[PDB]
Each structure stands twice: as structure tokens, then as C-alpha cells.
Amino acid sequence: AVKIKLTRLGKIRNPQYRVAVADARTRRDGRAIEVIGRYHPKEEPSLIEINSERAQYWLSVGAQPTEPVLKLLKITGDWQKFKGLPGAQGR
């Protein structure tokens, strides 16, 4: 199944994560199908970046994100837009 997962490409003490769409049967830091954002858990609150339309297309086609990508999608509101929920932004 297609999943949207976080890919870490930082150094030892800078765990930067990229919001990418990848196949489930792949390593964590592998060649994803398509990168659709990033997430830096080292700013004051955080750094969240979502394309919000390629993610929508993948969600409508069957891609299933994990728990942190799901939380980021809920934060950015794109998951709410896809599911029809009222609040389209909760940043």
C-alpha cells in the first residue's frame, strides 16, 4: 500500500524530516515516490511545510500516511479539506 511517511536526512543531532510519499515495502531513508513537504522539529514550535494538493491527490488515490504525517495533515488542514471536515486550518 502507498504510504506518506517522514524521511530523515539531517545530521546526528539535527533530525530534519521530509514529508514524502513512498511505498511501504521500502527503507525509511529510501527513494520515495514523491516528496510532498518537510517538517523540522527543531524550531521553537516547529517548521511545517505541506504542498496540500499533491497530498490531496494521493489521499484521494489511496495513499495512507502514518501517525506523524497524519498529525501534520490535521495541523495544516489538508486532511480536513479532503475529508470534508469544517475546520480547514488549525495551525
Q: Least distance to RNA from the beta carbon of 58, Å? A: 7
Mark residues 47-76: x for contact with RNA by CB under 7 A, - for none. Answer: -x-----------xxxxxxxxxx-x--xx-
d(CA 55, CA 86): 18
Under the phi-then-psi rule, with left for phi > 0, alpha for psi from -120 to 50, and beta for the rest, what region is 84? left
DSSP state letter for 60: H
Among 2, 51, 52, 82, binds RNA (CB under 7 A): 2
- Lookup: cell for 59: 489521499
Binding residues for RNA (CB under 7 A): 1-3, 5-18, 23-31, 33, 38, 41-42, 45-46, 48, 60-69, 71, 74-75, 79-80, 83, 85, 87, 90-91
